Amino acid sequence: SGIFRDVSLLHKPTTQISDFHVATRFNDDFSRAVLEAEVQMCGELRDYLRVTVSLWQGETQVASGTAPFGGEIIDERGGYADRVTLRLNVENPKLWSAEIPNLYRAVVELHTADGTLIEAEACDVGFREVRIENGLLLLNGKPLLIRGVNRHEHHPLHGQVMDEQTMVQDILLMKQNNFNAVRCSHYPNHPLWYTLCDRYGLYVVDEANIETHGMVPMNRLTDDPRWLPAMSERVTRMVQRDRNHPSVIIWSLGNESGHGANHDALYRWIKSVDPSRPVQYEGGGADTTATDIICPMYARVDEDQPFPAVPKWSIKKWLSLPGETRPLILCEYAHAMGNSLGGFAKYWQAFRQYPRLQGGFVWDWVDQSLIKYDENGNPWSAYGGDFGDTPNDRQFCMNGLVFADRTPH
Amino acid sequence: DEANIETHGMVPMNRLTDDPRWLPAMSERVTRMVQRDRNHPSVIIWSLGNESGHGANHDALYRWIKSVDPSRPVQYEGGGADTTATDIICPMYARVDEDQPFPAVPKWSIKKWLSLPGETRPLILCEYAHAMGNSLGGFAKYWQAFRQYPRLQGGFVWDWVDQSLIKYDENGNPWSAYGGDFGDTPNDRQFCMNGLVFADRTPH
Ligand code: NA
Ligand code: NA
Ligand code: NA
Ligand code: NA
């Protein structure tokens, strides 16, 4: 517990940019793109107000557009007078991917017609298209093969406080170890994380802070309308916050919370607000109506585990169940707990032979061990119960590929 | 029930079946079969023939049956086992886990075949586990797979009886003959014996 992430103060003018959405759409071969920027304001509405959205490639400005507020007509009562959408044509754009994290800089200026800048907000932009077609998850028209890992925000000394140093470090080891994607298990991460992924180049699964595993049954709350409000905010605010990061390629509804009507609602909400990205969720069986990807945890390659209500089929069999057509990406697989990862190659071989097996996210990145001190001030690695904490689940918080200090297993 | 159409030796295999001038002769072989056997309950699937590649003639005829006898599915393995002239993915000799990615007409692992992007048909091998001489090694692997995957709905082993023919020696005693034993040539020797039982019906 505590004030574990940054605290700050921000000054905005009275007439301000209260929101902005950045989208990139492409032509059949990506040789041409349209960057669309929706900008919203708070402040007195005035005729002389303008928005200028400019696109830069390094120190080169590649595109720009300016316009007064007042969106198009949308219904019988009109349109959003406090909004406006800029559309910028980009030819032969340099595309973003984890292999080549090309980025552009988008600068949104709020200013007077005549020139006076009120404020400017900005972001990095990755031109890329994420889309599921014919059962495959494509990136820029090509099928991804996910080399992922789940990663909590954990630090042996600091606990749940995340610093750039550590983040950078995690990123590099992952890249140096052939990983191309990471899952935010199981909550939106510290802001800087997304920026780093954008820049170094990693595919990200951004996940809502919603986990009700201890319930009985698991969907006790998620299936209850009375909890829909609290849940919705865990989803909506995430989306509103991270929708412009190119690194984020999929949204996730949370984790281990069974499957409830609430998930369905929320799933549709997202699809509605941001069609640019697929939505997945593993709860209730991993192939529910609330997920665009079959995303099981721990399904085996060849071996079926027919649990009731929520079987975990052999991943290869799962794909060809009658009527099934989705891609399969394990949200969790290969539990790296201790002396583990036996049978890892087996998964890879399957991922390589079957087109719709587009990989998965190993469970997980780093051991959740906390440093303690002995009678003579020497530090040692602690786990559940080592703090008088009980009930506890002992070493089960230690399942990483690397030790808490980042030394590899 | 399978129309009497096989043009295996053409180069490429669909040389005639893709020719509209052969449509007619081909049509009769399909139509007259349906016309004749359409009342037998035992017939559950129609087959367009065998090893004649994949040509337009097959699409037209596939359509003819569907039209005239919606009661039964039509299958055809030529041209790749999963062409638009077949309701059933019905490959010959596709392996359980092992891909054989021949160009133009690959034979994927059956388990893999079912879930290729956009694929939804059931799969029943029109030919499998080639029973020539001391064979059938790996038969169990298929059974396990068929049992495990709903869409893997079995197949037809190749084949039931050895095509040996009886000949006699000076002594007047009978012997089982094969390819070339009659002075025939060119011939394919023992290739005509792929059965589960010998010609006299004695099991292998
Ligand atoms: Na694959
Ligand atoms: Na754990
Ligand atoms: Na089956
Ligand atoms: Na033969």
Coordinates of C-alpha atoms and ligand atoms in Angstrom, one line a residue:
Chain A
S1 CA 0.0 0.0 0.0
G2 CA 0.8 3.7 -0.3
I3 CA 1.6 6.5 -2.7
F4 CA 3.6 4.3 -4.9
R5 CA 3.7 6.2 -8.1
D6 CA 4.5 9.8 -8.9
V7 CA 2.8 12.8 -7.5
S8 CA 2.7 16.0 -9.5
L9 CA 1.2 19.3 -10.3
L10 CA 0.2 20.4 -13.6
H11 CA -0.8 23.9 -14.9
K12 CA -3.2 24.3 -17.7
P13 CA -4.7 27.4 -19.1
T14 CA -8.3 28.1 -18.8
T15 CA -8.8 27.5 -22.5
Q16 CA -7.3 24.1 -23.0
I17 CA -6.8 20.9 -24.7
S18 CA -8.8 18.5 -22.5
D19 CA -8.4 15.5 -24.8
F20 CA -6.9 14.2 -28.1
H21 CA -7.0 10.9 -30.1
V22 CA -4.5 9.8 -32.6
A23 CA -5.3 7.4 -35.3
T24 CA -3.5 6.0 -38.4
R25 CA -5.3 4.4 -41.3
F26 CA -3.6 2.8 -44.3
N27 CA -4.0 1.9 -47.8
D28 CA -3.9 -1.6 -49.1
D29 CA -0.2 -1.8 -49.1
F30 CA 0.6 0.8 -46.6
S31 CA 2.1 3.0 -49.0
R32 CA -0.2 5.8 -48.0
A33 CA -1.6 6.8 -44.6
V34 CA -4.0 9.2 -43.1
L35 CA -3.4 10.5 -39.6
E36 CA -6.6 11.6 -37.9
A37 CA -6.4 13.7 -34.8
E38 CA -9.5 14.4 -32.7
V39 CA -9.0 17.3 -30.4
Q40 CA -11.2 18.4 -27.7
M41 CA -11.2 21.7 -25.7
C42 CA -12.5 23.1 -22.4
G43 CA -12.8 26.8 -22.3
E44 CA -14.9 29.5 -23.7
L45 CA -15.8 28.8 -27.2
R46 CA -14.4 31.4 -29.7
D47 CA -14.3 32.0 -33.4
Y48 CA -10.7 32.8 -33.5
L49 CA -9.7 29.5 -31.8
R50 CA -7.7 27.0 -33.9
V51 CA -6.0 23.7 -33.7
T52 CA -2.8 22.9 -35.6
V53 CA -1.6 19.4 -35.7
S54 CA 1.8 18.9 -37.1
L55 CA 3.8 15.7 -37.8
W56 CA 7.5 15.5 -37.6
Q57 CA 10.1 13.0 -38.6
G58 CA 13.0 13.9 -36.5
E59 CA 13.6 17.6 -37.3
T60 CA 11.6 17.3 -40.6
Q61 CA 8.0 18.4 -40.5
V62 CA 6.2 15.9 -42.7
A63 CA 2.6 17.2 -42.5
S64 CA 0.3 19.6 -40.9
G65 CA -3.3 20.9 -40.6
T66 CA -5.0 23.7 -38.8
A67 CA -8.7 24.2 -38.2
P68 CA -11.3 26.0 -36.0
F69 CA -13.3 24.0 -33.6
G70 CA -16.7 22.5 -34.5
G71 CA -17.0 18.9 -35.4
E72 CA -19.3 17.6 -38.1
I73 CA -23.0 17.1 -37.6
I74 CA -23.6 13.9 -35.7
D75 CA -27.2 13.9 -34.8
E76 CA -30.4 15.9 -34.8
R77 CA -29.1 18.3 -32.3
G78 CA -25.9 19.0 -34.2
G79 CA -22.2 18.3 -33.5
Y80 CA -19.4 18.9 -30.9
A81 CA -18.6 22.6 -31.1
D82 CA -15.8 22.0 -28.6
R83 CA -14.1 19.6 -31.0
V84 CA -12.4 19.3 -34.2
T85 CA -10.7 16.5 -36.3
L86 CA -7.5 17.1 -38.3
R87 CA -6.7 14.7 -41.1
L88 CA -3.1 14.5 -42.3
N89 CA -2.0 12.6 -45.4
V90 CA 1.4 10.8 -45.0
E91 CA 2.9 9.2 -48.0
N92 CA 5.2 6.2 -47.7
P93 CA 5.1 6.4 -43.9
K94 CA 7.8 4.6 -41.9
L95 CA 5.9 2.0 -40.1
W96 CA 6.1 1.1 -36.4
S97 CA 6.9 -2.4 -35.1
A98 CA 8.9 -4.1 -32.4
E99 CA 11.4 -5.0 -35.0
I100 CA 11.7 -1.2 -36.2
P101 CA 10.2 1.1 -33.7
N102 CA 9.9 4.0 -36.1
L103 CA 8.1 7.0 -34.6
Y104 CA 6.9 10.4 -35.5
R105 CA 6.2 13.3 -33.3
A106 CA 2.7 14.8 -33.2
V107 CA 2.3 18.3 -31.9
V108 CA -1.1 19.6 -31.1
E109 CA -1.3 23.3 -30.8
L110 CA -4.2 25.2 -29.4
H111 CA -3.8 28.8 -30.6
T112 CA -5.5 32.0 -31.9
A113 CA -6.3 32.2 -35.6
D114 CA -4.0 34.8 -35.8
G115 CA -0.9 33.1 -34.3
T116 CA -0.8 33.2 -30.5
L117 CA -0.2 29.8 -29.1
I118 CA -2.3 29.0 -26.1
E119 CA -0.7 25.6 -25.3
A120 CA 0.6 22.6 -26.9
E121 CA 0.3 18.9 -26.0
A122 CA 2.2 16.2 -28.0
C123 CA 2.9 12.5 -28.4
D124 CA 4.9 10.0 -30.3
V125 CA 3.1 8.3 -33.1
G126 CA 3.8 4.8 -34.5
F127 CA 2.2 4.2 -37.8
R128 CA 0.8 0.7 -37.7
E129 CA -2.2 -1.3 -38.3
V130 CA -3.3 -4.1 -35.9
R131 CA -6.0 -6.3 -37.2
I132 CA -7.4 -9.8 -37.1
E133 CA -8.3 -11.2 -40.4
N134 CA -9.3 -14.6 -41.4
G135 CA -8.3 -15.9 -38.0
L136 CA -4.8 -14.3 -37.8
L137 CA -3.6 -11.4 -35.8
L138 CA -1.8 -9.1 -38.4
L139 CA 0.6 -6.3 -37.8
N140 CA 1.1 -4.0 -40.8
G141 CA -0.6 -6.8 -42.8
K142 CA 1.8 -9.6 -41.5
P143 CA 1.1 -12.3 -39.0
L144 CA 2.7 -11.8 -35.6
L145 CA 4.4 -14.5 -33.8
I146 CA 4.3 -13.4 -30.2
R147 CA 7.5 -13.9 -28.1
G148 CA 6.0 -12.6 -24.9
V149 CA 6.3 -12.4 -21.3
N150 CA 4.0 -11.3 -18.5
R151 CA 5.6 -8.7 -16.2
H152 CA 4.6 -7.3 -12.9
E153 CA 5.9 -4.1 -11.6
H154 CA 8.1 -5.6 -8.9
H155 CA 11.2 -4.5 -7.1
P156 CA 13.0 -6.5 -4.3
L157 CA 13.9 -3.3 -2.5
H158 CA 11.2 -0.9 -3.4
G159 CA 8.3 -3.2 -3.8
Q160 CA 5.9 -1.9 -6.3
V161 CA 7.6 1.4 -7.1
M162 CA 8.9 1.6 -10.6
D163 CA 11.9 3.5 -11.7
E164 CA 13.1 4.2 -15.2
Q165 CA 16.4 2.4 -14.6
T166 CA 14.7 -0.8 -13.7
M167 CA 12.3 -0.5 -16.6
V168 CA 15.0 0.1 -19.0
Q169 CA 16.9 -2.8 -17.7
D170 CA 13.9 -5.1 -17.9
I171 CA 13.4 -4.0 -21.5
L172 CA 16.8 -4.6 -22.6
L173 CA 17.2 -8.1 -21.1
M174 CA 13.9 -9.0 -22.7
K175 CA 15.1 -7.8 -26.1
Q176 CA 18.4 -9.3 -25.7
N177 CA 16.6 -12.5 -24.9
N178 CA 14.4 -12.5 -28.1
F179 CA 11.2 -11.3 -26.5
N180 CA 9.0 -8.9 -28.6
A181 CA 6.1 -8.5 -26.4
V182 CA 5.0 -8.0 -22.8
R183 CA 1.7 -8.2 -21.0
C184 CA 0.8 -5.7 -18.2
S185 CA -0.1 -8.4 -15.7
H186 CA -2.7 -7.4 -14.4
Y187 CA -3.1 -3.7 -14.3
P188 CA -2.2 -0.5 -16.2
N189 CA 1.5 0.2 -15.6
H190 CA 3.4 3.3 -14.7
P191 CA 3.1 5.8 -17.6
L192 CA 6.7 5.8 -18.6
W193 CA 6.5 2.0 -19.4
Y194 CA 4.4 2.7 -22.5
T195 CA 6.8 5.4 -23.7
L196 CA 9.8 3.0 -23.4
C197 CA 7.9 0.2 -25.2
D198 CA 7.1 2.7 -27.9
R199 CA 10.7 3.6 -28.2
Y200 CA 12.6 0.5 -27.8
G201 CA 9.9 -1.4 -29.6
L202 CA 7.8 -4.0 -27.8
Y203 CA 4.1 -5.1 -28.4
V204 CA 2.0 -4.5 -25.4
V205 CA -1.1 -5.9 -23.9
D206 CA -2.7 -3.1 -21.7
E207 CA -4.9 -4.7 -19.0
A208 CA -7.5 -3.3 -16.8
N209 CA -7.0 -3.5 -13.0
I210 CA -9.7 -6.0 -12.4
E211 CA -9.0 -9.3 -10.7
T212 CA -11.6 -11.1 -8.6
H213 CA -10.1 -14.5 -8.4
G214 CA -10.9 -15.2 -4.7
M215 CA -14.6 -15.1 -5.4
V216 CA -17.0 -18.1 -5.4
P217 CA -17.8 -18.7 -8.2
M218 CA -15.1 -16.6 -9.9
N219 CA -17.7 -14.4 -11.8
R220 CA -19.6 -13.5 -8.6
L221 CA -18.9 -9.8 -9.0
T222 CA -18.3 -9.5 -12.8
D223 CA -21.6 -11.0 -13.4
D224 CA -23.3 -8.5 -11.1
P225 CA -24.7 -5.3 -12.5
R226 CA -24.2 -3.6 -9.3
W227 CA -20.5 -3.9 -9.9
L228 CA -20.6 -2.7 -13.4
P229 CA -19.8 0.9 -12.6
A230 CA -16.6 0.3 -10.6
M231 CA -15.5 -2.2 -13.3
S232 CA -16.3 0.1 -16.1
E233 CA -14.0 2.8 -14.8
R234 CA -11.2 0.4 -14.5
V235 CA -11.6 -0.2 -18.3
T236 CA -12.6 3.2 -19.6
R237 CA -10.0 5.3 -17.8
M238 CA -7.3 2.9 -19.0
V239 CA -8.4 3.4 -22.5
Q240 CA -8.7 7.0 -22.3
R241 CA -5.2 7.2 -20.9
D242 CA -3.3 4.9 -23.2
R243 CA -5.1 4.9 -26.5
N244 CA -2.3 6.9 -28.3
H245 CA 0.7 4.7 -27.5
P246 CA 1.6 2.7 -30.6
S247 CA 3.2 -0.1 -28.4
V248 CA -0.2 -1.0 -27.0
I249 CA -1.7 -3.3 -29.6
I250 CA -4.3 -5.2 -27.6
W251 CA -6.6 -4.3 -24.7
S252 CA -7.4 -6.8 -22.0
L253 CA -10.5 -6.7 -19.7
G254 CA -8.5 -7.8 -16.6
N255 CA -7.7 -11.3 -15.2
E256 CA -9.1 -14.3 -13.5
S257 CA -12.5 -12.9 -12.8
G258 CA -14.5 -15.6 -14.4
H259 CA -16.8 -14.5 -17.2
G260 CA -19.7 -12.1 -16.4
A261 CA -22.3 -10.0 -18.3
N262 CA -20.1 -7.1 -17.2
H263 CA -17.2 -8.3 -19.4
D264 CA -19.5 -8.4 -22.4
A265 CA -20.7 -4.9 -21.9
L266 CA -17.2 -3.6 -21.4
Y267 CA -15.8 -5.6 -24.2
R268 CA -18.3 -3.9 -26.6
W269 CA -17.6 -0.5 -25.1
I270 CA -14.0 -0.8 -26.1
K271 CA -14.7 -2.1 -29.6
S272 CA -17.0 0.8 -30.0
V273 CA -14.6 3.5 -28.9
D274 CA -11.4 2.0 -30.4
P275 CA -11.7 -0.3 -33.2
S276 CA -7.9 0.0 -33.9
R277 CA -7.2 -2.7 -31.4
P278 CA -8.3 -6.3 -30.7
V279 CA -9.6 -7.1 -27.2
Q280 CA -8.9 -10.2 -25.3
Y281 CA -9.8 -11.8 -22.0
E282 CA -9.2 -15.2 -20.6
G283 CA -11.8 -15.5 -17.9
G284 CA -14.5 -18.1 -18.0
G285 CA -12.9 -20.5 -20.5
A286 CA -10.6 -18.3 -22.6
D287 CA -12.8 -18.4 -25.7
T288 CA -15.8 -16.5 -24.5
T289 CA -17.8 -13.9 -26.4
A290 CA -15.8 -11.3 -24.5
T291 CA -12.5 -12.0 -26.3
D292 CA -11.2 -11.6 -29.9
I293 CA -8.3 -14.1 -29.2
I294 CA -8.4 -17.6 -27.7
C295 CA -6.1 -16.7 -24.9
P296 CA -5.8 -19.6 -22.4
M297 CA -3.5 -19.9 -19.5
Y298 CA -1.5 -23.1 -19.4
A299 CA -3.2 -25.1 -22.1
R300 CA -0.6 -27.8 -23.2
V301 CA 0.6 -28.5 -26.6
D302 CA -0.8 -31.9 -27.3
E303 CA -2.4 -32.8 -24.0
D304 CA -6.1 -32.1 -23.3
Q305 CA -7.2 -31.0 -19.7
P306 CA -10.9 -31.3 -19.9
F307 CA -12.0 -29.5 -16.8
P308 CA -15.6 -28.9 -16.4
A309 CA -17.0 -25.6 -17.6
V310 CA -13.5 -24.5 -18.4
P311 CA -11.5 -27.1 -20.2
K312 CA -8.0 -26.4 -21.3
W313 CA -7.8 -28.1 -24.7
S314 CA -4.5 -29.1 -26.4
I315 CA -3.7 -25.7 -28.1
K316 CA -3.6 -27.5 -31.5
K317 CA -7.0 -29.1 -31.0
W318 CA -8.5 -25.9 -29.6
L319 CA -8.1 -24.1 -33.0
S320 CA -10.2 -26.5 -35.0
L321 CA -13.2 -27.0 -32.7
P322 CA -16.3 -26.7 -34.8
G323 CA -17.2 -23.1 -35.6
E324 CA -13.9 -21.8 -34.1
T325 CA -11.9 -19.4 -36.2
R326 CA -9.9 -17.1 -33.8
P327 CA -6.2 -16.9 -33.4
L328 CA -4.8 -18.5 -30.3
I329 CA -2.2 -16.6 -28.1
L330 CA -1.7 -18.0 -24.6
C331 CA -2.1 -15.3 -22.0
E332 CA 0.2 -17.4 -19.8
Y333 CA 2.2 -20.4 -20.5
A334 CA 5.4 -22.2 -19.4
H335 CA 5.3 -21.4 -15.6
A336 CA 9.0 -20.4 -14.9
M337 CA 8.8 -21.3 -11.3
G338 CA 12.1 -22.5 -10.0
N339 CA 13.8 -25.2 -12.0
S340 CA 11.3 -25.1 -14.8
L341 CA 10.6 -24.5 -18.5
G342 CA 10.8 -28.2 -19.3
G343 CA 8.8 -28.8 -22.6
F344 CA 9.3 -25.1 -23.7
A345 CA 10.6 -26.1 -27.2
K346 CA 7.5 -28.1 -27.7
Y347 CA 5.5 -25.0 -27.6
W348 CA 7.7 -23.2 -30.1
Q349 CA 7.6 -26.0 -32.5
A350 CA 3.8 -25.8 -32.5
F351 CA 3.8 -22.0 -32.7
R352 CA 6.0 -22.4 -35.8
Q353 CA 4.0 -25.1 -37.5
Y354 CA 0.4 -23.7 -37.0
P355 CA -0.4 -20.4 -38.5
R356 CA -3.2 -19.6 -36.0
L357 CA -1.0 -20.4 -33.0
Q358 CA 0.6 -17.0 -32.8
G359 CA 2.5 -17.6 -29.6
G360 CA 2.1 -16.5 -26.0
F361 CA 3.3 -14.8 -22.9
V362 CA 5.5 -16.7 -20.5
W363 CA 4.6 -16.6 -16.8
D364 CA 6.6 -14.7 -15.8
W365 CA 9.4 -12.1 -16.0
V366 CA 10.9 -11.7 -12.5
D367 CA 10.7 -13.5 -9.1
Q368 CA 8.5 -11.6 -6.7
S369 CA 11.1 -11.9 -3.9
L370 CA 11.6 -9.2 -1.3
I371 CA 15.0 -8.5 0.3
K372 CA 15.3 -9.0 4.1
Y373 CA 18.1 -8.8 6.6
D374 CA 19.5 -11.2 9.1
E375 CA 20.8 -10.5 12.6
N376 CA 24.2 -9.4 11.1
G377 CA 22.7 -7.2 8.4
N378 CA 23.2 -9.6 5.5
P379 CA 20.4 -9.4 2.9
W380 CA 18.4 -12.4 1.7
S381 CA 15.6 -13.3 -0.5
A382 CA 12.1 -13.6 1.2
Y383 CA 8.8 -15.0 0.0
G384 CA 5.2 -15.5 1.4
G385 CA 5.0 -15.8 5.2
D386 CA 8.6 -14.4 5.6
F387 CA 6.9 -11.2 7.1
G388 CA 4.6 -13.0 9.6
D389 CA 2.0 -12.7 6.8
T390 CA -0.6 -15.4 7.0
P391 CA -2.4 -17.1 5.4
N392 CA 0.2 -17.0 2.7
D393 CA 1.2 -18.9 -0.4
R394 CA 4.9 -19.2 0.3
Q395 CA 7.3 -19.3 -2.8
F396 CA 4.4 -19.2 -5.3
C397 CA 5.2 -15.5 -5.8
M398 CA 8.5 -16.6 -7.4
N399 CA 7.8 -17.8 -11.0
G400 CA 10.2 -15.6 -13.0
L401 CA 12.8 -16.1 -15.7
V402 CA 15.1 -13.9 -13.8
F403 CA 15.8 -13.3 -10.2
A404 CA 14.4 -10.2 -8.4
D405 CA 17.8 -8.5 -8.8
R406 CA 17.4 -9.3 -12.6
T407 CA 20.1 -11.9 -12.6
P408 CA 18.9 -14.6 -14.9
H409 CA 17.7 -18.0 -14.1
Chain B
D1 CA -20.1 -43.8 -54.5
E2 CA -17.4 -42.7 -57.0
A3 CA -17.7 -41.7 -60.7
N4 CA -15.5 -43.6 -63.1
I5 CA -13.2 -40.8 -63.9
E6 CA -9.4 -41.1 -63.3
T7 CA -6.9 -39.2 -65.5
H8 CA -3.8 -39.7 -63.4
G9 CA -1.3 -40.1 -66.2
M10 CA -2.1 -36.8 -68.0
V11 CA 0.5 -34.0 -67.6
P12 CA -0.4 -31.9 -65.6
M13 CA -3.1 -34.2 -64.0
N14 CA -6.0 -31.9 -65.0
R15 CA -5.2 -31.6 -68.6
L16 CA -8.6 -33.0 -69.6
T17 CA -10.8 -32.2 -66.6
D18 CA -9.9 -28.6 -67.1
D19 CA -10.9 -28.8 -70.8
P20 CA -14.6 -28.0 -71.6
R21 CA -14.4 -30.2 -74.6
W22 CA -14.1 -33.2 -72.0
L23 CA -17.0 -31.9 -69.9
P24 CA -19.5 -34.0 -71.7
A25 CA -17.9 -37.4 -71.4
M26 CA -17.1 -36.5 -67.9
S27 CA -20.6 -35.4 -67.2
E28 CA -22.1 -38.7 -68.1
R29 CA -19.9 -40.6 -65.8
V30 CA -21.2 -38.4 -62.9
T31 CA -24.8 -38.0 -63.9
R32 CA -25.5 -41.6 -64.8
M33 CA -24.1 -42.7 -61.5
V34 CA -26.4 -40.5 -59.4
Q35 CA -29.2 -41.4 -61.6
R36 CA -28.7 -45.1 -60.9
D37 CA -27.7 -45.2 -57.2
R38 CA -29.7 -42.2 -55.7
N39 CA -32.1 -44.5 -54.0
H40 CA -29.6 -46.5 -51.9
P41 CA -29.4 -45.4 -48.3
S42 CA -26.0 -46.9 -47.9
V43 CA -24.6 -44.3 -50.3
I44 CA -24.0 -41.3 -48.2
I45 CA -21.4 -39.4 -50.1
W46 CA -20.9 -38.7 -53.8
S47 CA -17.4 -38.7 -55.2
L48 CA -16.3 -37.0 -58.4
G49 CA -13.7 -39.5 -59.3
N50 CA -10.0 -39.9 -58.5
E51 CA -6.6 -38.4 -59.4
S52 CA -7.7 -36.2 -62.3
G53 CA -6.2 -32.9 -60.9
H54 CA -8.7 -30.1 -60.3
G55 CA -10.4 -28.6 -63.4
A56 CA -13.5 -26.5 -64.2
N57 CA -15.3 -29.7 -65.3
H58 CA -15.2 -30.7 -61.6
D59 CA -16.7 -27.5 -60.3
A60 CA -19.5 -27.7 -62.8
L61 CA -20.3 -31.4 -61.8
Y62 CA -19.9 -30.8 -58.2
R63 CA -22.6 -28.1 -58.7
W64 CA -24.8 -30.4 -60.7
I65 CA -25.0 -33.0 -57.9
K66 CA -25.6 -30.5 -55.2
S67 CA -28.3 -29.3 -57.3
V68 CA -30.0 -32.5 -58.0
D69 CA -29.3 -34.4 -54.8
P70 CA -29.0 -32.1 -51.9
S71 CA -29.3 -35.2 -49.6
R72 CA -25.6 -36.1 -49.8
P73 CA -22.3 -34.3 -49.6
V74 CA -19.9 -34.4 -52.5
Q75 CA -16.3 -35.0 -52.1
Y76 CA -13.2 -34.9 -54.3
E77 CA -9.5 -35.0 -53.4
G78 CA -7.9 -33.9 -56.8
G79 CA -6.0 -30.6 -57.0
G80 CA -5.1 -30.4 -53.4
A81 CA -7.9 -32.2 -51.2
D82 CA -9.6 -29.0 -50.3
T83 CA -10.7 -27.4 -53.5
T84 CA -14.0 -25.7 -54.2
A85 CA -15.2 -29.0 -55.7
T86 CA -15.3 -30.8 -52.2
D87 CA -17.5 -30.6 -49.1
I88 CA -14.9 -32.7 -47.3
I89 CA -11.1 -32.1 -46.9
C90 CA -10.2 -35.6 -48.2
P91 CA -6.5 -36.0 -48.7
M92 CA -4.7 -39.1 -49.5
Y93 CA -1.8 -40.0 -47.2
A94 CA -1.7 -36.8 -45.3
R95 CA 0.3 -37.6 -42.1
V96 CA -1.0 -37.0 -38.6
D97 CA 1.7 -34.6 -37.3
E98 CA 4.1 -34.4 -40.3
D99 CA 3.7 -31.8 -43.0
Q100 CA 4.6 -32.6 -46.7
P101 CA 4.5 -29.2 -48.2
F102 CA 4.6 -30.2 -51.9
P103 CA 4.2 -27.1 -54.1
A104 CA 0.8 -26.4 -55.4
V105 CA -0.7 -29.4 -53.6
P106 CA 0.7 -29.7 -50.2
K107 CA -0.2 -32.5 -47.9
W108 CA -0.3 -30.9 -44.4
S109 CA -0.5 -32.8 -41.1
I110 CA -4.2 -33.5 -40.7
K111 CA -4.3 -31.8 -37.4
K112 CA -2.8 -28.8 -38.9
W113 CA -5.0 -28.9 -42.0
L114 CA -8.2 -28.4 -40.1
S115 CA -7.3 -25.1 -38.6
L116 CA -5.6 -23.3 -41.5
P117 CA -6.9 -19.7 -41.8
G118 CA -10.6 -19.8 -42.9
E119 CA -10.9 -23.6 -43.0
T120 CA -13.9 -25.1 -41.5
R121 CA -14.7 -28.4 -43.2
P122 CA -14.6 -31.9 -41.6
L123 CA -11.7 -34.0 -42.7
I124 CA -11.8 -37.7 -43.7
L125 CA -8.9 -39.2 -45.6
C126 CA -9.9 -40.6 -48.9
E127 CA -6.8 -42.8 -48.6
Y128 CA -4.5 -43.5 -45.7
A129 CA -2.2 -46.2 -44.1
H130 CA -1.1 -47.8 -47.4
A131 CA -1.3 -51.4 -46.6
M132 CA 1.4 -52.7 -49.0
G133 CA 3.2 -55.9 -47.7
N134 CA 4.5 -55.5 -44.1
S135 CA 2.9 -52.1 -43.4
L136 CA 0.4 -50.3 -41.1
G137 CA 3.2 -49.0 -38.9
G138 CA 1.7 -45.8 -37.3
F139 CA -1.9 -46.9 -37.7
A140 CA -2.5 -46.1 -34.1
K141 CA -1.3 -42.6 -34.4
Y142 CA -4.2 -41.9 -36.7
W143 CA -6.8 -43.4 -34.4
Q144 CA -5.6 -41.4 -31.5
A145 CA -5.9 -38.3 -33.5
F146 CA -9.3 -39.1 -34.9
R147 CA -10.5 -39.7 -31.4
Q148 CA -9.1 -36.5 -30.1
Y149 CA -10.2 -34.0 -32.8
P150 CA -13.8 -33.7 -33.5
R151 CA -13.2 -32.5 -37.1
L152 CA -10.9 -35.5 -37.8
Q153 CA -13.7 -38.0 -38.8
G154 CA -11.6 -40.9 -39.9
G155 CA -10.8 -42.2 -43.4
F156 CA -10.5 -45.0 -45.9
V157 CA -7.5 -47.3 -45.5
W158 CA -5.7 -48.1 -48.8
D159 CA -6.6 -50.9 -49.5
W160 CA -8.8 -53.9 -48.8
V161 CA -7.5 -56.7 -51.0
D162 CA -4.3 -57.4 -52.8
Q163 CA -4.7 -57.3 -56.6
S164 CA -2.6 -60.5 -57.2
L165 CA -3.7 -62.8 -59.9
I166 CA -3.3 -66.6 -59.9
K167 CA -1.0 -68.3 -62.4
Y168 CA 0.2 -71.8 -62.6
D169 CA 3.6 -73.4 -63.0
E170 CA 4.5 -76.5 -65.1
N171 CA 3.5 -78.7 -62.2
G172 CA 0.1 -77.1 -62.5
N173 CA 0.3 -75.5 -59.1
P174 CA -1.2 -72.0 -58.4
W175 CA 1.0 -69.0 -57.6
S176 CA 0.2 -65.4 -56.9
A177 CA 1.2 -63.1 -59.7
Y178 CA 1.7 -59.4 -60.1
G179 CA 2.8 -56.6 -62.3
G180 CA 4.9 -57.8 -65.3
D181 CA 4.2 -61.4 -64.5
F182 CA 2.0 -61.7 -67.7
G183 CA 4.6 -60.2 -70.0
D184 CA 3.0 -56.9 -69.4
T185 CA 5.3 -53.9 -69.7
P186 CA 5.8 -51.3 -68.8
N187 CA 4.3 -52.5 -65.5
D188 CA 4.4 -51.5 -61.9
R189 CA 5.2 -54.8 -60.4
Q190 CA 4.0 -55.3 -56.8
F191 CA 2.4 -51.9 -56.6
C192 CA -1.0 -53.6 -57.2
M193 CA -0.8 -55.4 -53.8
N194 CA -1.7 -52.9 -51.0
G195 CA -4.3 -54.9 -49.3
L196 CA -5.2 -55.8 -45.7
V197 CA -6.1 -59.3 -47.0
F198 CA -4.6 -61.5 -49.7
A199 CA -6.5 -62.1 -52.9
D200 CA -8.1 -65.3 -51.4
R201 CA -9.4 -63.1 -48.5
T202 CA -6.9 -64.5 -46.0
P203 CA -5.9 -61.7 -43.8
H204 CA -2.6 -60.0 -43.7
Ligands
NA1 NA 1.9 -19.9 -35.8
NA2 NA 2.3 -17.1 -8.8
NA3 NA -12.7 -36.9 -34.6
NA4 NA -1.4 -49.4 -55.8

